[PDB]
Amino acid sequence: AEEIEKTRRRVNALEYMTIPQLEETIYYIKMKLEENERAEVTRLIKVKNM
Amino acid sequence: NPTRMELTRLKKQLTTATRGHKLLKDKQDELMRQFILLIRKNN
Amino acid sequence: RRGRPIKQKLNPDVPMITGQRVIDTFFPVTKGGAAAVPGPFGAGKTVVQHQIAKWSDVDLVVYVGCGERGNEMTDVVNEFPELIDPNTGESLMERTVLIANTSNMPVAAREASIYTGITIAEYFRDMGYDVAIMADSTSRWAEALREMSGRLEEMPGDEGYPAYLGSRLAEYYERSGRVIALGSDQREGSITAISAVSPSGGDISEPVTQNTLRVVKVFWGLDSSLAQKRHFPSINWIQSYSLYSTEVGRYMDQILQWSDMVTEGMRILQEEEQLNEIVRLVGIDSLSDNDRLTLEVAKSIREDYLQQNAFDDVDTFTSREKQFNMLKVILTFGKEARKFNEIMEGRERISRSKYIPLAKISSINEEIKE
Amino acid sequence: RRGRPIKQKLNPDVPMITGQRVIDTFFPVTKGGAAAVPGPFGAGKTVVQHQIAKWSDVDLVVYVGCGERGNEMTDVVNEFPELIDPNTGESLMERTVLIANTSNMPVAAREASIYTGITIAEYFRDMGYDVAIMADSTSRWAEALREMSGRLEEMPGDEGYPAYLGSRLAEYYERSGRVIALGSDQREGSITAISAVSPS
Amino acid sequence: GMQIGKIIKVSGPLVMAENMSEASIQDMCLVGDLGVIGEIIEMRQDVASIQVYEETSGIGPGEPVRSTGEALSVELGPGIISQMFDGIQRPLDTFMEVTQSNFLGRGVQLPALDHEKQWWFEATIEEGTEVSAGDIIGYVDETKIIQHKIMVPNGIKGTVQKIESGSFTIDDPICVIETEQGLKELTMMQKWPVRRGRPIKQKLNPDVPMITGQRVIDTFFPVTKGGAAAVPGPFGAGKTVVQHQIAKWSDVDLVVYVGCGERGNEMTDVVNEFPELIDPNTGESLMERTVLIANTSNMPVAAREASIYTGITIAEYFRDMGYDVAIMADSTSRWAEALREMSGRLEEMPGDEGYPAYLGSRLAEYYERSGRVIALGSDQREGSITAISAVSPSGGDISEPVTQNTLRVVKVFWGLDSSLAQKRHFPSINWIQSYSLYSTEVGRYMDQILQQDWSDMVTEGMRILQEEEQLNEIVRLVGIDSLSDNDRLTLEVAKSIREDYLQQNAFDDVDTFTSREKQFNMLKVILTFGKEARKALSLGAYFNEIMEGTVAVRERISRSKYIPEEELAKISSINEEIKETIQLIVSE
Amino acid sequence: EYRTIKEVVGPLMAVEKVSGVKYEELIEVRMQNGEIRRGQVLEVQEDKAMVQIFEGTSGINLKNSSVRFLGHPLQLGVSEDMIGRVFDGLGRPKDNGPEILPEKYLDINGEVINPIARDYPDEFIQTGISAIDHLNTLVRGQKLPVFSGSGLPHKELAAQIARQATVLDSSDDFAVVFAAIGITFEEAEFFMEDFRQTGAIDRSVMFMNLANDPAIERIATPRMALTAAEYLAYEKGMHVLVIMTDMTNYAEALREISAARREVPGRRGYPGYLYTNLATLFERAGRIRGLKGSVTQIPILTMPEDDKTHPIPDLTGYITEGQIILTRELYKSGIQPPIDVLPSLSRLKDKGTGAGKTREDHAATMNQLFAAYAQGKQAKELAVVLGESALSDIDKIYAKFAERFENEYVNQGFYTNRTITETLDLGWELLAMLPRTELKRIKDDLLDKYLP
Amino acid sequence: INGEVINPIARDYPDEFIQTGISAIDHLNTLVRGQKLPVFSGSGLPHKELAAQIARQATVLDSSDDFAVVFAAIGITFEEAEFFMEDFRQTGAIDRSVMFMNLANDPAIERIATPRMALTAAEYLAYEKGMHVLVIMTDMTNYAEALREISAARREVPGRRGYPGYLYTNLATLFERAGRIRGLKGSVTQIPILTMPEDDKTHPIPDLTGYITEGQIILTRELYKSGIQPPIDVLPSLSRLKDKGTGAGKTREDHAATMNQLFAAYAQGKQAKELAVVLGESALSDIDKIYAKFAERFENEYVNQGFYTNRTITETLDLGWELLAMLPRTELKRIKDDLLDKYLP
């Protein structure tokens, strides 16, 4: 019973904390990268015209 | 912080963590079955 | 801006003795080699370079303070004359040249300090001397290129750096190296380049670090995580590399009568890393005795060998032989223990090997086995 | 566009009574203080702002509908007349000035509505009154500046907002505060700013 | 005839030329003395800005620019069948013969069709007949299989004045029409701009199911005549075998194959294997009714972008005759890469992942050109173009722009799966991930034409497959020995569907094609066994008893796929043996 | 008429030597081959005008082409004869019907309702869908969108509302304006077939824009529809229900046109002005003081990646008065329509419910059903995480409640129309499962009268 | 030096097996005569040693005709150029070779010209002189960086991730200068080598190259840090023409089957190693303990052959069978009992 509970806690830590934290961070990075690359090409086109 | 190296690494940790979750859940289930047999003998 | 001409470029195959364990053992540099040290701020950027400057077995050291803090230049001129080579009796300042263009000095002069330094080093190289040139930091040089590029309204490359950035760095590092100098004597000389890089936040994907690593051969990645827990020098042993490892290994095997032990040491470190990828996202719960032993050997490599205090009178430098004996002891314990709670409760002598002035280290092997 | 002159600003150290338990207890705003109310869509931003308009112990409310729903402006004009103080018999409409430039009205006018509001607030502050200014929503004001910055072909800053977004907003809020007003009287007056933000 | 331009600027791939004021936007031009392929992108006064699609090394100011007077077009007429072109309709066979080289030299320009070959034109309309676009004035027996119908071109309307049978080249006037603008002459060839869809009278719903003969497709994921399907093409999942089966077995008249911009060595495979495909009806080569576009990655960006457009314009041409055409593109990921390159070259504002902001629209423009139509002309004939398109994303992930914009406008998705190929399941189409939006309509058609509840059986077949997924996870965890008799049975029926139905050997003489009638009978017996055995379970019989008692009849089900088309009764009579065998089991 | 085209670059054209040209003025280009292409003035400066051609500029020869400036912006010729007729994105007849004679022509941008003249949305529209009529009530003058996703049955729900929607106790003065934006041929045919088969066509105006139509036409489409709606509502006194799908295709077209003018991209690549632009469509909904008639809007959109924070659903949500959410979970359970009432909301619902609008028991039961359902689903999720042995009975009762609620109440079928009376009665049947002691959101007088 | 594009119908299909002497290539990711098969490496990975080894050991079985090697060095350091030249001289391979050496400190326009010089030489030897030519080029990334430099000099606005939009055309024009030609005796086989920026395969350079070339050989840091030489990771590696150069006549009949089997057992063994770390050695079955040991030996003895070890196809296939011999008959499913009874020790 003790081993069951210790196994359960590790499962729930992964399920409700570790994995979602990784999911949310991946989403964030992915978005931020995307934004900066659009801003970068926008500026390049401006510098192009200069 | 939001670099492409972090992205690829975190994507790897997610795959690993997902597999570890499945493995530990199976272990818990296997322990549960064996417990069922013992706990009935205990009763 | 013109490289001083030579007769012939040669292969740099003699390893430099820096006396810093992690470097000389796992990520070595040769006389004529080029090494980059990219690190976040507060990684011990400075102390690492000072250590190399003071302990390397070169004839002359050209130190270039490029766009950095003035107080660090002041420290060098105060400390260097006080560092006496006992086999010689004269100070390290008597074999040093200093070039200083601080962070608040005119921008354009950062580029000049870099080229001024390398040319002076080539001059001494041409005499048949082994020279080490310290560029700290190359990033401030690159930002001077970027500011000027911006002012010329050139099309910038990544992060605003000019499209010719890769090429500039290449032109600098191609001036380093082992050569046969011009002259009837055909004297042999060399320039070893040690360059600090300062990627923002420690993101090594930035163009300065990345273009640098395509032309240098040694990568000493400083790590903020190591620095925060006071692991110094904070060199990331998984990220770092040396393209001279193979050749230096051959040389060391011959001199000492080692390659296998360095390979085995790195393999343990790599294994600990892969194990820790799991322990972080699962826990140390279900570890076998074998895996627990691996983690203990790796712990020993990290704490007893990699960690090294530049401010300790003894620990500040470790000779080739002392290095050999220390790695031997560490690996021996691992090998014998491999042959868990039982063994661990029955290693302090190993932890303090770094403070031994040689028979007191070698004798540990017999205490381990018994 | 120019803040009305005063003698000097004073520390806003008197908590305002909104009668909203969560606010007065844990997150109180002082008279002359400023509160941002940022939230996602449909989180009851209009109910909150109405409650503060309706219950705060101020002499006058300036309510600015900046780039928002037509119906919410209509709702204010319909409801405010009906909210009667039982003691004095005055309606909330009889102590309110509201300024309205809905989401589909001229874009530039969103900026205009902001400054029209705060200037009327300063006016009644000068008389020695406590005034509340509700701006709903300042996000639409910023969008209007971003649209104009584009037309002007400016270098854009963070997220396309002009580089001077910071300072324009800072100027706005620094016009709020508790003051000693001009006049030999040295009378005291305040502007309390409640601003909705609508972050994407 | 139109004014020749003079180059004023060469800068990388960009050329500017003055004296271009009589040329038009999107005109194709020959740039320099060399005369390399270019296109007019901009015009300021008389100065045209030109994108050059071939190496601009060696070109300079002074040199001439000649416009071709039209945007990128195709020649359409006798001599187009069995030819292999690049994206811009350069005749690859002719290039070898004429230039006597293995290479496509910059500056070499050759006509797409053969303007010298004699054809027998057979007149089928007599003089004095009122005609307009689409009306058939005659035919040429062009290949061993396909009859090429000579139609009145678009923009011609009037009375036939002179026409007769005879031998002509595609340049000879075979007809005289008295139009409103006066007497005009017709030849056997017409031109058409690839970017503009060939016009129709009415677009119709594609509600006729295609017979591919491939069981997983026709039954569970059907495409209709005029429909479209997207197919991801991971390596080693046997995409080409599936494509070849579809090309030779499907009941269309003509196949148009488009290689968009493929790896050099992969293109060569297709160029080799496709002519070696044999037409099941005639025993001739498939090329006898195929037009093939072959682009390698080093073809000009113009040809790689035009690839699918060139192909569908040709398909539309054959469609206008009243034919059913399949247009098969592989890979549209590589076509889109040409668009992404063009976006960058034009210094545009980029859309997602650097693709042009118009990517969605261009894909929609392509797929909406496929379909079932009533062609123009007083016949009111129906034609169709069915589109089968390969996608091959960087990461194999669907969510990327190319596959995503495609799936917004196509109604069928065949998810080829490399894991299924590694488990020796062929064709490798994932029955869970795949879908067809035509299933419900096809189902009504089938129930009517077969006079059976075919749709009820298809859904029941899928339901067992869906439930199998759930049961497999339990087997992996708990164990096969821990399942109920009902569940053990369901797994067997799902295994039978997978093995005896889904799995299909393209290289077996009988298994390579399954007729619509045969498919019914096969799925009927597989489901009948499930029905009868489950009825046996609820009567008190045991799972193991049913299995051990029905060894002979289950093997008959397994061999159903090899039953000849002439002996469909040998499948249908399995039904009686099922009922009889299980009856004895329930007894004994 | 000018033969002075000076530049063509892509879809853009610059015309010189002109006079009296205005911003947004509609233009007509006569090509050298007699082909006619229309456009819009994007920008006007001294003697130059920058214009964009709807169809694009391919094949246009500059020197031999000419430009007519029409003197007015994009217009819709309106008539009451539009009911029962089908038009394209630009208001051109698409049904080959008889010739259509405009009473007047209207700027498709409309004019803004004076906030002082605006009347708050009021009174009930019966959609026939229980999940909407009871819990997320549609009010006349409301803008109430449907958030779906690809693969979800929003096309069936849209067509269902279009034929089922009605006003009670008011005969022959309700109409539907249906705008299809950037949809494929086949999906367009679905709507066409459905309207004609059910007879919904006789009370509808339809504007059909296809995925392969010009992107400028795709963005003109909802403006054509709304101009027609305002005419029928405010000038003819009708209650008009405007349904538009798919708003996601609209926004994509907007990004396409934006990027073509090389405007600086905003959040997620969409124009900086996406909010403002959407508002100029959705704010046309409402009522006017002293006028009979109303415009009610139901924009339909697919959330990319089912991400509710994506610009399209997010800024829409900031503009509309609520949202109806379709879910993958409920759709895979066969619930038709798969409406999740937990994240769904109608903000104006109080103005269309209660005595004499629906029925006196409307508000109370709604609150009770919603609150019991939330608790029911919570107990179901508790059985998943901790087992069935974790639940008290009543927890078990609430769990069973949520099952019936989804299977019998929310699930009603795509061809099934429920009167508000049928909806409310059915609500009481579900509430009867619970102990009366648990119906704590409803006062005693209502419980005694209605509880079966 | 620009070349002319090969008529797509005039190219012939790759037929002949090329023995590189490297098990992880010849067996699992076979190089075929006329293929374009690149190596994806990284900064501080030993692609230098592997390039030298491939050039050194590459041969076609029988033929009499030997391999002429064209070696282009693009933007590399002197130290590396000297290594290559010294290895070619010290082994006598230079007598078979033509070398074009471009250095890091050479102009960007020289770096751009280098691959084109090399390939022009190769097509002359191959298609005009009838020779069989192996072309090896490192580092392609340096070529790409040179493009950006010239592109910026003409003030062109970049495409994806800072590279020219016409990068595709540019790289495709290079890599498709290869293969057999119908009617001609000679051939060009291409092995481009590139380092992946930040070890990212989605980067424009490796991403576009993959779209052009018939597969890729992947070197990894994890394998190198473990001392595996060459550090080839077979799981993400692929050769798309492999089924065309293998089997009876070409290599041996048991080529295909052993490859599939080794691949599957390797993946299975890696899973087993991970299982032991997650759940303990308790959770491993007796079969599982073997797979774990299989994957260990596979990396250490099969993949890890050393940069100066030249394995014949026979030796390689034999070693595969000795490792597959660890497994019971029951596990070797992808191998028919016919050939399992002929070769299994």
* CB-based contact E185:E173 (threshold 8 Å): yes
**In sequence order, which residues have a C-beta less than 8 Å from that of residue E568 and are 6 or more positions away?**
E517, E518, E521
Tell me whether residues E360 and F252 touch, CB distance under 8 A: yes
Query: B16, B22, B26: which to substitute to probe chain C, counting the most C Cβ within 10 Å?
Result: B16
Q: Say if CB F284 and CB F141 are below 8 A apart.
A: no
Does residue A38 belong to the interface with chain F, where contact is any CB pair within 8 Å? yes
Would you list the domain boundaries of chain G?
Answer: 1-345
| Same domain for E162 and E14 | no
Whole-angstrom distance, CA of residue E43 vs CA of residue E539? 84
DSSP class of E4: P
Computed over its alpha carbons, how large is the radius of gyration of chain G? 21
Tokens encoding G11: 């190219």
Q: How far apart are CA A42 and CA E202, in angstroms?
A: 44
What is d(CA C299, CA C281) in angstroms, rounded to the nearest whole number?
Answer: 20
Chain-centre distance for alpha carbon D86: 26
E56 labelled as ligand-binding?
A: no
Same domain, C234 and C309: no
**Are C229 and C312 members of one domain?**
no
Cβ atoms of residues E175 and E162 within 8 Å: yes
Q: How far is Cα F353 from Cα F133, in angstroms, rounded to an integer? A: 9
The CA–CA distances, whole Å, from F153 to E360, F182, F330, F413 equal 22, 17, 11, 12
Handedness of CA F75, F79, F82, F83 (dihedral sign): positive
CB neighbours (10 Å) of residue D182? 14
The residue of chain C nearest to residue A47, with distances taken between CA atoms, is C155
The pair of three-digit structure tokens given for residue E78, joined into one six-digit string: 């006798």
- CB of B10 closer than 8 Å to CB of A29: yes
Residue with tokens 């509840």: E453
Comparing alpha-carbon positions, the chain B residue that sits nearest to A14 is B21
The residue whose two tokens read 């909010």 is F275
Tokens of C84: 């006496």
Distance CA G245, CA C40 (A): 51
Burial class (CB in 10 A: 0-12, 13-18, 19+), C24: buried
Alpha carbons F26 and F30: distance in angstroms, whole number:
14
Q: Rounded CA gap, G227 and C110, in Å?
A: 41
Q: After which residues is chain E broken (C to N over 2.5 A)?
A: none
Query: Which residue in C238, C141, C152 sits closest to C195, CA to CA?
Result: C141
- What sign does the CA torsion over E275, E278, E283, E289 have? negative
Residue whose C-alpha is closest to residue G33's, from G21, G20, G15: G15
Residues with Cβ within 8 Å of C4's Cβ and at least 6 positions away in sequence, in order, are: C119, C122, C123, C125, C126
Residue C28: cis peptide before it, omega within 30 degrees of 0: no
Fold of F1-452: Rossmann fold (3.40.50)
Contact partners, residue D185, CB within 8 Å, separation at least 6: D128
| Total count of domains within chain C | 2
Could you give the CA distance from residue G330 to residue G328 in angstroms, rounded to a whole number? 5
Question: Cα–Cα distance between E501 and F32 in angstroms, integer?
Answer: 61
| Inter-residue contact G70 to G125 (CB < 8 Å) | yes
As a whole number of Å, the CA-based R_g of chain D is: 17
Peptide bond into C233 cis (omega under 30): yes
E251 and E154, same domain (yes or no): no
* d(C-alpha D139, C-alpha D197), whole Å: 5
C-alpha dist (Å) from residue C26 to D59, F1, G225: 76, 81, 11
Q: Is G14 on the interface with E (CB under 8 A)?
A: yes
Which among E385, E411, E436 is the end of a domain? E436
Enter the tokens of residue E317. 């041409």
d(CA C43, CA C228): 8
The number of beta carbons lying within 10 Å of the beta carbon of residue A13 is 16
Helix (H) or strand (E) holding D148: helix D138-151
Question: What single string gives the DSSP state of each residue in F125-156?
Answer: -B-S-HHHHTTS--BTT-B--EEE-TTS-HHH
Is residue E25 a contact partner of residue E60, using CB atoms and an 8 Å limit?
A: no
Measured CA distances, A47 to C160, E157, G152 (Å): 11, 55, 11
Domain CATH for D57: 3.40.50.300
Q: Report the side by side order of strands in the sheet with E130-131.
A: E130-131, E158-163, E175-179, E182-186
Cβ G283–B27 below 8 Å, yes or no? yes
Q: What is the radius of gyration, based on Cα positions, of chain C?
A: 22
- What does DSSP assign to residue D156? B
Neighbours of chain B (3+ CB pairs under 8 A): A, C, G
Phi, psi angle pair for E151, to nearest 5°:
-105, 155
Residues 244-273 of G with CB under 8 A from E: 264
Asked if chain E contacts chain C via 3 or more Cβ pairs within 8 Å, the reply is no
Give yes or no for a contact between E253 and E325, defined as CB atoms under 8 angstroms apart: yes
The letter for the amino acid at E419 is S
Burial of F66: CB neighbours in 10 Å, binned 0-12, 13-18, 19+: middle
E560, two tokens: 């159903």
For this PDB entry, the determination method is: X-ray
Query: Across E234-370, where does the E strand assignment appear?
Result: 254-262, 290-296, 324-330
On whether D12 is known to bind a ligand per the annotation, the reply is: no
Question: How many residues are there in chain B?
Answer: 43
Choose among G251, G232, G245, G309: nearest CA to G52: G309
Tokens of A8: 């359960």
Geometric angle at alpha carbon G43, from G39 and G48, rounded to 5°: 55
DSSP state of C206: S
Which DSSP state fits C140? H
Q: Find the distance separating the first CA and the last CA of chain E, reported in whole Å.
A: 95
Rg of chain A over all Cα atoms, to the nearest angstrom? 21
Helix (H) or strand (E) holding F403: helix F393-404
The answer to whether E135 and E126 are in contact (CB under 8 A) is no
Structure tokens at G260: 């599939």
- Rounded distance, CA E300 to CA E310, Å? 14
Determine phi and psi for E532, rounding to 5 degrees: -65, -40
Nearest to G189 by CA among G131, G133, G242: G133
| Strand, coil or helix: D62 | strand
End residue of a domain, out of E186, E212, E241: E186
* Angle (nearest 5°) at CA E177 between E171 and E182: 110
Same domain, C335 and C230: no
Count of C-beta atoms within a 10 Å radius of residue F192:
17
Task: Report phi then psi at F195, rounded to 5.
Answer: -60, -45
Give the gap in angstroms from C-alpha C260 to the nearest C-alpha of chain G: 10
- Please report, as a single letter, which amino acid is at residue C369: K
CA separation for the pair F119, F113 (Å, rounded) = 10
> Could you tell me where the beta strands, DSSP code E, fall in E172-266?
175-179, 182-186, 190-193, 202-204, 228-232, 254-262
Cα separation, G5 vs F54, whole angstroms: 39
Mark whether C281 and C318 lie in a shared domain. Answer: yes
Is F58's Cβ below 8 Å from some Cβ in E? yes
Residue D45 labelled as part of a binding site:
yes
Find out whether F85 and F97 touch, Cβ atoms under 8 Å: yes
Measured at the alpha carbon of residue D179, what is the angle toward residues D175 and D185, in degrees to the nearest 5?
A: 135
Q: Is C65 annotated as a binding residue?
A: no
CATH of the domain at C340: 1.10.1140.10
Check whether residue E103 and residue E226 sit in a common domain. Answer: yes
The residues that bridge with E17 in the sheet, in sequence order, are: E7, E48
Cα–Cα distance, G221 to C238 (Å, whole number): 9
Longest CA–CA separation in chain A, Å: 73
Q: How remote is the C-alpha of F365 from its chain's centroid?
A: 28
Task: Report how far residue E17's alpha carbon sits from residue E3's, in angstroms, rounded to the nearest whole number.
Answer: 12
Tokens of F398: 């609430």
- Which residues, other chains included, contact E339 with Cβ-Cβ below 8 Å and sequence gap of 6+? E305, E355, E356, E359, E362
- Note the CATH architecture for domain G1-345: 3-Layer(aba) Sandwich (3.40)
Closest chain A residue to C150, measured at CA: A47
Extract the tokens encoding D167: 């300072």
C264 and C182 assigned to the same domain: no
Tell whether E352 is within 8 A of chain G (Cβ).
no
**Domain end call among C242, C264, C284:** C242
Q: What single string gives the DSSP state of each residue in G199-265? A: G-TTSHHHHHHHHHSSEEEEB-HHHHHTT-SS-B-TTT-EETTGGGS-STTTS-TTHHHHHHHHHHH
Cα distances (angstroms) measured from residue C194 to each of C25, C137, C233, G17, G81: 17, 10, 15, 46, 22
d(CA E272, CA E310): 22
Query: Residue F205: phi, psi to the nearest 5?
Result: -110, 135
Of F359, F421, F418, F428, nearest in space to F130 by CA: F418
Buried b / exposed e over F125-145, threshold 16 CB at 10 Å, is bbbbbbbbbbbbbbbbbbbbb
Instruction: List phi, psi (to 5°) of G244.
Output: -100, -15
DSSP line for F193-211:
HHHHHHTGGGGEEEEEEET
Could you give the count of Cα atoms lying within 13 Å of C159 in the half-sphere of its Cβ? 16
Q: Which among B8, B20, B24 has the least Cβ separation from residue G200?
A: B8
> Looking at D91-198, which runs of residues are DSSP E strands?
96-101, 130-136, 177-181, 188-197
Contact C30, C252 (CB under 8 A): no
- E122 phi/psi in degrees, rounded to 5: -110, 115
Cα distance from N-terminal residue to C-terminal residue, chain C? 63
Q: Kindly give, in sequence order, each residue whose CB lies less than 8 Å from that of residue G171, ignoring residues fewer than 6 positions away.
A: G140, G144, G208, G209, G212
Residues of C with Cβ-Cβ distance to A47 under 8 angstroms:
153, 155-156
Helix (H), strand (E) at residue B18:
helix B4-42
Neighbouring-strand partners of residue G187:
G132, G180
DSSP β-ladder status, G67-76 and G97-103: parallel
List of residues 6+ apart from F130 with CB closer than 8 A? F409, F410, F412, F418, F422, F423, F426, F427
* E509 shares contact with chain A (CB less than 8 Å): no
Contact by Cβ (8 Å): G40, G218: yes
For residues C229 and C250, membership in a common domain is answered with no
CB F165 within 8 A of CB F133: no
Judge contact between G38 and G193, C-beta under 8 A.
yes
Please report, for residues E234, E292, E436, E565, F272, the alpha-carbon distance to residue E239 in angstroms, rounded to integers and kept in the order given.
8, 18, 18, 27, 43
G169 vs E301: CB contact, 8 Å cut-off? yes
Give the bridge partners for D64, in sequence order.
D99, D135
H or E segment and range at residue G189: strand G187-195
Q: Point out which residues pair with E436 in neighbouring strands.
A: E412
Distance CA G123, CA C182 (A): 41
Look up residue E379 and give its two tokens: 């016949």
C188/C307 same-domain check: no
Q: How close, in Å, is residue G154 to chain A by CA atoms?
A: 10
Asked if C226 and C252 sit in the same domain, the reply is no
Q: Identify any residues that bridge with E29 across adjacent strands, giving them in sequence order.
A: E38, E67
Domain range for C89 is 1-242
Instruction: Among D75, D150, D159, select the one facing F267 at the smallest CB separation.
Output: D159
Are C265 and C301 in contact by the 8 Å Cβ rule? The answer is yes
Which helix (H) or strand (E) segment holds residue F317: the answer is helix F311-317
Is the separation of the CB atoms in F106 and F73 below 8 Å?
no
CB crowding D115-130: b at 16 or more within 10 Å, else e: bbbbebbbebbbebbb
CA angle C97, C103, C108 (to 5 degrees): 85
Substitution target in G151, G154, G156, G157 with the highest count of A β-carbons within 10 Å is: G157
Alpha helices in C160-244 (DSSP H): 165-173, 207-213, 224-228
* Tokens describing residue C321: 């032989």
Determine which helix (DSSP H) or strand (DSSP E) holds E412, and give its type and residue range. strand E412-413
Q: Using CB atoms within 10 Å of the CB of residue D198, give its burial: 0 to 12 exposed, 13 to 18 middle, 19+ buried.
A: buried
Residue recorded with tokens 């999940």: F131
**Burial zone of F171 (CB within 10 Å; 0-12 exposed, 13-18 middle, 19+ buried):** exposed
A4/B31 CB distance under 8 A: yes
Report resolution (Å) to 1 decimal. 3.9
